[PDB]
């Protein structure tokens, strides 16, 4: 069954006048008249070329003629790729082993009450209320508005700890930063073009979480596979691409080392919003891409087990539910499925507040639920603060 009905398909040109089939005679067409008339033969106009370059009337060359065209098809992963298998697919692509829960090294950063923010619960409740209720003149702010706002306000609240931690001065949250990283996986060349937003850069690299013994023990772990779904599914298969690895910044940029990738799923429509598993997969892939770009920049474009693993954190949130990730890239030898494997600690579905009431629900003229968050969970914010304070 072919798609596209004939009536909608472009109409076939009318049959040529029989006069054109007679070798010896030149047909009399209305070309000289410079307009159509129904009683003269239809001219066969030669193909026309503008003769110069007009940007607003540009006709790009066929895909095969582009300089970067390559027979080998790369598979790109960008901010708007939704993996079918989600976390499993991301782990297979990045040659990564998953660990439930954040590492103790970072989780302990908030155990002592000195790191605890003064009036922390009040501040977090105020941030949530500002994001969800007080943000704009509209009664019910949309996600497109309160997701970036909630993330930024949480980041500012954490940044307020500069008092206790002067080392927080050596970092900056840049926006619109884009990185690119390419690598091979069983002869499949995979690129990640991470755009997202809110890259937290630091002047110093993050300390390694996994020890040499753990990195080696990752060898025994077998990379989970899924059949018949290929790992390439949902990745943009492109034959016109470039293989350069880009960290997103020119050489000599202060704050070169990525610290946290803040990914936000702010789409108003549920279908346009990533599922939690797909968002975790995107977090894994972007963290791996940034770490791999850092490794390629530092230790060259050589496939090898990294002597100094690269650590990158990421927080992927939909405005209410958060997902926390710490990715340790400890090998650029991705092609083979055997050997030491990168490893990611993930905390999934940490919901800051289970629901928010913008209006007071009234039954029989009785206020049942007051305006404001209900079911607030400070554990998610302590995890957020632990990630922010990590490395300082």
């Amino acid at each position: 069954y072919e798609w596209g009905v004939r009536s909608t398909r472009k109409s076939e040109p009318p049959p040529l006048d029989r006069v054109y089939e007679i070798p010896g005679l030149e047909p009399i067409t209305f070309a000289g008249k410079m307009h159509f008339v129904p009683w003269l033969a239809r001219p066969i106009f030669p193909p026309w070329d503008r003769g110069y370059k007009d940007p607003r009337f540009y006709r790009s060359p066929p895909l095969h003629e582009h300089p970067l065209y390559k027979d080998q098809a790369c598979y790109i992963f960008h901010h708007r790729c939704r993996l079918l298998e989600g976390v499993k697919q991301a782990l297979w692509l990045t040659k990564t082993k998953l660990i439930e829960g954040l590492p103790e090294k970072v989780l302990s950063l908030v155990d002592d009450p000195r790191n605890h923010i003064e009036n922390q619960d009040e501040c977090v409740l105020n941030v949530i209320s500002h994001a969800r209720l007080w943000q704009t003149t509209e009664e019910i702010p949309k996600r497109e508005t309160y997701c970036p706002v909630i993330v930024d306000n949480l980041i500012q609240l954490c940044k307020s700890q500069i008092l206790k931690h002067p080392s927080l001065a050596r970092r900056i949250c840049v926006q619109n930063s884009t990185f690119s990283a390419t690598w091979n996986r069983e002869s499949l060349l995979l690129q990640v073009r991470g755009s997202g937003g809110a890259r937290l850069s630091t002047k110093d690299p993050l300390p390694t979480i996994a020890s040499r013994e753990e990195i080696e023990a990752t060898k025994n772990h077998v990379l989970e596979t899924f059949y018949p779904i290929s790992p390439i599914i949902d990745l943009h298969e492109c034959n016109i691409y470039d293989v350069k690895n880009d960290t997103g910044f020119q050489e000599g940029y202060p704050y070169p080392y990525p610290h946290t990738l803040y990914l936000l799923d702010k789409a108003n429509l549920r279908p346009h919003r990533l599922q939690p598993d797909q968002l975790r997969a995107k977090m894994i892939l972007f963290a791996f891409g940034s770490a791999l770009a850092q490794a390629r920049l530092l230790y060259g474009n050589d496939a090898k087990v990294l002597e100094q693993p690269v650590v990158v954190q990421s927080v992927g949130t939909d405005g209410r539910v958060f997902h926390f990730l710490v990715f340790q890239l400890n090998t650029t030898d991705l092609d083979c499925n055997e050997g030491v494997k990168n490893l990611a600690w993930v905390d999934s579905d940490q919901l800051l507040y289970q629901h928010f009431w913008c209006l007071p629900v009234i039954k029989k003229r009785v206020v049942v639920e007051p305006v404001g968050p209900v079911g607030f969970k400070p554990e998610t914010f302590r995890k957020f603060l632990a990630l922010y304070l990590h490395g300082a």
């Binding site: 596209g4 909608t8 018949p228 990745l235």
Partner: protein, 234 residues
């Protein structure tokens, strides 16, 4: 009239496609089918009825994973999003198709009959006689056209030479080359018969307009020898 069919998309995709209602009107704007109009706005999901469609630069039998089973507004039967290799496609889900199940699509006519597991596609020659089938083709590679409504199931009545006799749900025999593919089991949503519309409003939602109010009363024309007995008075 300036009517152009909405069925203009040329490339298959999983996205629901915005479809324009016809109202029973031709491209000329005149009503051609009565009782059609209005109803809930719908989006069309392009169903891949050629279940054995090996991916590009690929061939031979292939397996697929049932990502999900979904209600289809444009059909009585329900559809299934199913993914294989690096592609996804909509198919017509069978009675017991479940999310996460595995489906087989093969073109191999084995010497022995293949174990008929519901939901997979084999050439009619590969099926045991008497197995319930659906999404049957008329010609090899034409694409499923028969036994596509909810709960319908044809029977592979006979197999002789390269020709298989199928019993369509209307209990009519049909001859098809045994190389043409069909899927095992009965179509999903088997309980579609028992659905009760309940009220005229539900039909209007479904898009069916009320029947004409006109009262409609041919006849056997008597032969001259019989005209004397047509209306014998009481």
């Amino acid at each position: 009239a300036n009517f152009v069919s909405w069925k203009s998309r040329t490339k298959y995709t999983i996205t629901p496609v915005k479809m324009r209602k016809s109202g029973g009107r031709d491209h000329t704007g005149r009503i051609r089918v009565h009782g059609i109009g209005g109803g809930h706005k719908q989006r069309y999901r392009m169903i891949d009825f050629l279940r054995f469609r090996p991916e590009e630069t690929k061939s031979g039998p292939f397996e697929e994973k049932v990502i999900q089973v979904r209600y289809d507004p444009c059909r009585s039967a329900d559809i299934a999003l199913v993914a294989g290799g690096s592609r996804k496609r909509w198919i017509i889900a069978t009675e017991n198709m479940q999310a996460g199940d595995t489906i087989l699509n093969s073109n191999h006519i084995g010497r022995m009959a293949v174990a008929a597991r519901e939901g997979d596609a084999h050439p009619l020659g590969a099926l045991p006689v008497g197995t319930l089938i659906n999404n049957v083709e008329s010609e090899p590679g034409r694409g499923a056209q028969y036994i596509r409504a909810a709960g319908t199931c044809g029977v592979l009545l006979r197999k002789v030479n390269g020709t298989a006799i199928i019993q369509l749900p209307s209990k009519r025999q049909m001859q098809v080359l045994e190389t043409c593919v069909a899927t095992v089991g009965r179509v999903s949503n088997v309980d579609h018969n028992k659905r009760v519309i309940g009220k005229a409003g539900r039909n209007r939602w479904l898009g069916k307009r009320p029947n004409s109010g006109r009262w409609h009363r041919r006849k056997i024309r008597p032969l001259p020898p019989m005209k004397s007995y047509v209306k014998l008075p009481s």
